[PDB]
Design a protein around this motif. Structure first.
Motif, PDB file in Angstrom:
ATOM      1  N   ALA A   1       1.280   8.274  -9.100  1.00 46.43           N
ATOM      2  CA  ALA A   1       0.648   6.986  -8.825  1.00 46.43           C
ATOM      3  C   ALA A   1       0.671   6.058 -10.034  1.00 46.43           C
ATOM      4  CB  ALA A   1      -0.794   7.190  -8.359  1.00 46.43           C
ATOM      5  N   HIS A   2       0.412   6.599 -11.219  1.00 48.53           N
ATOM      6  CA  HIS A   2       0.429   5.750 -12.404  1.00 48.53           C
ATOM      7  C   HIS A   2       1.842   5.300 -12.759  1.00 48.53           C
ATOM      8  CE1 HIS A   2      -3.840   6.897 -13.464  1.00 48.53           C
ATOM      9  NE2 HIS A   2      -3.810   5.590 -13.648  1.00 48.53           N
ATOM     10  N   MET A   3       2.838   6.139 -12.487  1.00 51.96           N
ATOM     11  CA  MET A   3       4.210   5.731 -12.777  1.00 51.96           C
ATOM     12  C   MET A   3       4.589   4.615 -11.810  1.00 51.96           C
ATOM     13  SD  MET A   3       6.996   5.780 -14.439  1.00 51.96           S
ATOM     14  CE  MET A   3       7.089   7.268 -15.491  1.00 51.96           C
TER      15      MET A   3
ATOM     16  N   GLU B   1      -0.436  -0.701  -4.177  1.00 48.21           N
ATOM     17  CA  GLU B   1      -1.661   0.046  -4.442  1.00 48.21           C
ATOM     18  C   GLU B   1      -1.671   1.414  -3.782  1.00 48.21           C
ATOM     19  OE1 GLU B   1      -4.103  -1.587  -6.485  1.00 48.21           O
ATOM     20  OE2 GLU B   1      -4.660   0.518  -6.696  1.00 48.21           O
ATOM     21  N   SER B   2      -1.823   2.454  -4.598  1.00 50.66           N
ATOM     22  CA  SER B   2      -1.855   3.815  -4.090  1.00 50.66           C
ATOM     23  C   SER B   2      -3.183   4.074  -3.388  1.00 50.66           C
ATOM     24  CB  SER B   2      -1.660   4.827  -5.229  1.00 50.66           C
ATOM     25  OG  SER B   2      -0.289   4.961  -5.574  1.00 50.66           O
ATOM     26  N   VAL B   3      -3.103   4.801  -2.283  1.00 48.64           N
ATOM     27  CA  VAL B   3      -4.264   5.160  -1.487  1.00 48.64           C
ATOM     28  C   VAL B   3      -4.076   6.612  -1.068  1.00 48.64           C
ATOM     29  CG1 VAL B   3      -5.519   4.691   0.640  1.00 48.64           C
ATOM     30  CG2 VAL B   3      -4.455   2.818  -0.639  1.00 48.64           C
TER      31      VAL B   3
ATOM     32  N   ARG C   1       2.628   2.540 -10.359  1.00 48.45           N
ATOM     33  CA  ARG C   1       1.854   1.350 -10.665  1.00 48.45           C
ATOM     34  C   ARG C   1       2.524   0.608 -11.823  1.00 48.45           C
ATOM     35  NH1 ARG C   1      -4.386   2.362 -11.326  1.00 48.45           N
ATOM     36  NH2 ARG C   1      -4.242   2.381  -9.033  1.00 48.45           N
ATOM     37  N   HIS C   2       3.144   1.363 -12.723  1.00 43.50           N
ATOM     38  CA  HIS C   2       3.841   0.769 -13.860  1.00 43.50           C
ATOM     39  C   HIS C   2       5.106   0.063 -13.368  1.00 43.50           C
ATOM     40  CE1 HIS C   2       5.883   0.207 -17.649  1.00 43.50           C
ATOM     41  NE2 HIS C   2       6.933   0.815 -17.126  1.00 43.50           N
ATOM     42  N   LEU C   3       5.756   0.666 -12.378  1.00 44.75           N
ATOM     43  CA  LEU C   3       6.989   0.126 -11.805  1.00 44.75           C
ATOM     44  C   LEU C   3       6.722  -1.026 -10.843  1.00 44.75           C
ATOM     45  CD1 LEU C   3       8.600   3.597 -11.054  1.00 44.75           C
ATOM     46  CD2 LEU C   3       9.478   1.937 -12.718  1.00 44.75           C
TER      47      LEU C   3
ATOM     48  N   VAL D   1       0.861  -1.173   0.000  1.00 45.29           N
ATOM     49  CA  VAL D   1       0.000   0.000   0.000  1.00 45.29           C
ATOM     50  C   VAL D   1       0.898   1.222   0.000  1.00 45.29           C
ATOM     51  CG1 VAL D   1      -1.695   1.350   1.264  1.00 45.29           C
ATOM     52  CG2 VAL D   1      -1.871  -1.141   1.223  1.00 45.29           C
TER      53      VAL D   1
ATOM     54  N   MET E   1      -1.650  11.784  -9.377  1.00 48.49           N
ATOM     55  CA  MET E   1      -2.093  10.810 -10.378  1.00 48.49           C
ATOM     56  C   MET E   1      -0.941  10.413 -11.289  1.00 48.49           C
ATOM     57  SD  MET E   1      -5.878  11.740 -11.766  1.00 48.49           S
ATOM     58  CE  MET E   1      -5.765  13.534 -11.738  1.00 48.49           C
ATOM     59  N   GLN E   2      -0.097  11.377 -11.644  1.00 49.15           N
ATOM     60  CA  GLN E   2       1.031  11.061 -12.510  1.00 49.15           C
ATOM     61  C   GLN E   2       1.961  10.144 -11.746  1.00 49.15           C
ATOM     62  OE1 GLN E   2       2.789  14.915 -13.648  1.00 49.15           O
ATOM     63  NE2 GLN E   2       1.596  14.735 -15.541  1.00 49.15           N
TER      64      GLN E   2
END
Ligand code: COD
Ligand code: COD
Ligand code: COD
Lengths: 157, 157, 157, 157, 157, 157
Positions: free
Chosen positions: B101-103, B112-114, B105-107, B83, B98-99
């Motif tokens: 968090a998505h980076m 999981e970002s919260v 998530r790719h890595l 988390v 958001m930028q």
């Protein structure tokens, strides 16, 4: 650890499934709470929405689909939820989410708002737009679980 | 369930304390991870920031303060975190988060970002603002843990 | 009724002039206060910015231009101001101005922040943008007081 | 019909490629113009950025990569461009792009700004983010043209 | 110096009281103007809203509560107001406020829009949400003057 | 190159004329598409709106005014449009524009969304506000072509 993920889910979309799936991975039990009577007449009835949501999350063991009619905070309290799941799309009205989270915190401080982010694929879609497009002869199959797609066609036929 | 709350924390503020505290309420263990962040030319050294954060969170048994110079995603994986905690004050935070968090998530997709929201009391402060006020001898005791205010006093003239 | 309109004014633009002018319409005396702002590495020295602002507002009898290196809140109190003027161009301004306004309210509660909106003509310019254009010899005569444009011309090659 | 797509492109990313590609679909010729941007202290020299962009767009016959240190508006006029392409990822982009677009319109009214939106896949990346990840040896192969990833690898340790 | 603070005030909240109080501290006379017939049926009637507002501001000497039915600008003009008070919460739709201020400026340029900021306590609450929550069995006592709270209970009983 | 500029145009404003004029300068043929039946009863009928729009753009040779009742994407497809014109005012709901562009891209990927920016003069006005003001005895002559102004007075008489 009991979390509640409330909404109208009229109807449940791939974006909602994305969010509840992420919630089940970090919390013991997740209650997908479907608001019974919304200020505006929903496309599907509560029973239909619950059935669709149940089918769409049947594969998620720690997910419980339930309907509610009172203020969300009152229901969350009686259900003993301590986590409130909110999905934040890239096109979300952030200011509104802050209003909502603070009002919910005022009403039930023991319920902590938690914001999850959907995949990029579902980050720009709102249920409202999906319905409008469907009602106006546009293809929205991509955004919905197959069971919901079938129910939607029957509803608009 | 291990969560990581990364940041530069230069210096840690009551806003950061608010967020990490909320994190401990829903997750078993929380790692407050301080990035070296040389590109941001921090006011305090990593060692100073870690010491400050440690004392400011000593009362929180579920919190573990650590510094790191690695890719945050690798550090999270190596710390066995699943988390990723982030705090949101307003719009600006949301877009940038958001930028990030998505980076991440790719890595590391299993991290999981919260996002959590602070109290209204700390919804408008930041390390940058506190430092600017302190550089002009303004009273910032209200926004910082006792030990941090002292250290900031000393750090400046 | 004394109001203070603080800023870095590096250099003062027609947008700033628009705001200070509106300020003079509703308040008896307005102090255009120029902060040294060393952290921002200003293009013009404080003395240069004050001189420029003085000439650009000479026609406004209710305006007093002054420079300061103190905490803005202390300077305001020491100048006997009770109104803090800020200009808002768009969202970005608003969010940042709220943080600044709440910090100043904490430092000096009797200094009331007031936000004014410029004309549509100056709703998209900033000192930073004008300087960037000028660094490339672009025509910025339209956005700056005569004396300021001259000074900017000279300042650059 | 000649369009210009200016930027610092430090380095060019798949997001930039997405935008320039969409530009070629509606305009006869597109000039990808790389500004020297010394004020931004670019990671790659102008010559390096131009070389990288040239190879990353070699497959696009309608694209012409060029570097410039002039005022963008003068360069556009001198290149006979009448369309100014900009990419929008979110709010932040929009606000800043409006200031820039209105300044350019003041400098060259016959250069019409046009904003395009990238795919969802590249809606959250930026040169700054990719560089930060790369500085920590994170895998950014997914976000950059092959030649650019290689160059970035080399550039860093 | 006559200022007007218009709205529907259905019903007046602690946030509205916060704003009008700040307005009375910087302007000679403040007209709390209550819009008679809103596009949507208000919870309380104009007479009720005026009575509630009068009681809630009875302690503020330079405050005059009045109802109006024409376009706000037409009323402001006949009332000889030169200042237009707008409260800007942290969750305000800033874009909408800009539209409104510019339209009002077009209609009556002699009326200057002035934005005031409420305390952090009332920065995230909208009257709309307060009503929705109250209508759905939620506790909103905290957000309303005691007189309004009592009237609201009777209305919903 | 065929572009489509869709909307309700109820009624067409100087802002719409500004945008379509810019579109005709970069694209061969522009279809000003007027939505027949909007979710809410429009002030003017489709025939009236088409007539007004035709008159207001009579001077623009490559502009074709047409009405449509199906989903915009379905009409754009049958009309063989490959460019979708969207006007972005400074007060536009950018998040909504992103939702819309992505939904339209899903429906018809061969239709590229292109955002144009109006002059500062029309950057803060929405048709909705223009109508509300007109319906409530406010002067909106400035925002409308003379032909539309005359038709509006008759409609409200
Ligand atoms: C250092 C990182 C985490 C960026 O940190 P950041 O500057 O946002 O830290 P900062 O101390 O400013 O804030 C940390 C968190 O607390 C939040 N926060 C700060 N103040 C408050 C407040 N008053 N109330 C609520 N939340 C707050 C921030 O929004 C953020 O979510 C990032 O750059 C990183 O991961 N660096 C390591 C290298 C790497 O892997 N980079 C690639 C990342 S994709
Ligand atoms: C210098 C201060 C005021 C920040 O100034 P800022 O950079 O915003 O000044 P700047 O010249 O850029 O702008 C001043 C004001 O004019 C506004 N403005 C600028 N251009 C325009 C325009 N074209 N139209 C309308 N308003 C405008 C700004 O939004 C701002 O409200 C602040 O850092 C400060 O108070 N410094 C002193 C030290 C201190 O006490 N710091 C703590 C503050 S809490
Ligand atoms: C260099 C300029 C164009 C600013 O460039 P900028 O930093 O925005 O370039 P950058 O490479 O970051 O981006 C270029 C464009 O691509 C867009 N973009 C970047 N990533 C993405 C993405 N992933 N998806 C979609 N669009 C993207 C940007 O939003 C921008 O529209 C400007 O400063 C300039 O014109 N400089 C020359 C001097 C001058 O004349 N200045 C005055 C200008 S008014």
């Amino acid at each position: 650890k009991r979390a509640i993920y409330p909404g109208t889910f009229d109807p449940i979309t791939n974006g909602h499934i994305d969010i509840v799936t992420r919630a089940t991975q970090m919390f013991d039990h997740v209650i997908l709470a479907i608001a019974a009577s919304p200020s505006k007449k929903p496309m599907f009835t509560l029973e239909e929405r619950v059935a669709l949501a149940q089918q769409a999350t049947a594969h998620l063991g720690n997910v419980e689909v339930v309907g509610f009619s009172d203020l969300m905070a009152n229901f969350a309290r009686n259900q003993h939820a301590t986590v409130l799941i909110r999905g934040l799309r890239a096109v979300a009205d952030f200011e509104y989410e802050m209003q909502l989270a603070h009002m919910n915190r005022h009403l039930m401080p023991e319920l902590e708002s938690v914001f999850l982010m959907p995949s990029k694929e579902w980050s720009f879609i709102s249920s409202s737009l999906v319905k409008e497009v469907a009602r106006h002869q546009g293809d929205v199959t991509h955004f919905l679980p197959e069971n919901v797609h079938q129910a939607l066609m029957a509803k608009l036929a």
